[PDB]
Design a protein around this nucleic acid. Structure first.
Length: 91
DNA sequence: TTGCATTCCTCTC
DNA sequence: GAGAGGAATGCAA
């Protein structure tokens, strides 16, 4: 589903299409309405050839955000317990 | 526990 | 109403 090749081009898309600000929507000269994940999905097909839904992309963007949000706090908790012990014991 | 999908929300048009 | 991104849920493994 997120095979190394599809994953590669997805990582490529992330570098190609920078993250959006508050404005999430843009119109082409023909009037078709565009989002970042839609472009990302589009770029996948361009390089991979495979089909990845606009929503499949959004799901992936989410889980990567989840992970990094964990890895940072799991570090802020792995030491918060070591700090708590030394303090609770120093009492 | 979490990587997937799927709904819910709120924006532009 | 159409269609979008992103947060909320839903859901096996």
């Amino acid at each position: 589903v997120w095979s190394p090749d599809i994953e590669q081009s997805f990582q490529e898309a992330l570098a190609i299409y920078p993250p959006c600000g508050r404005r999430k929507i843009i119109l082409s000269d023909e009037g078709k309405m565009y989002g970042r994940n839609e472009l990302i999905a589009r770029y996948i097909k361009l390089r991979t050839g495979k089909t990845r839904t606009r929503k499949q992309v959004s799901s992936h963007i989410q889980v990567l955000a989840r992970r990094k949000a964990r890895e940072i706090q799991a570090k802020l908790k792995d030491q918060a317990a070591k700090d708590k012990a030394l303090q609770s014991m120093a009492a």
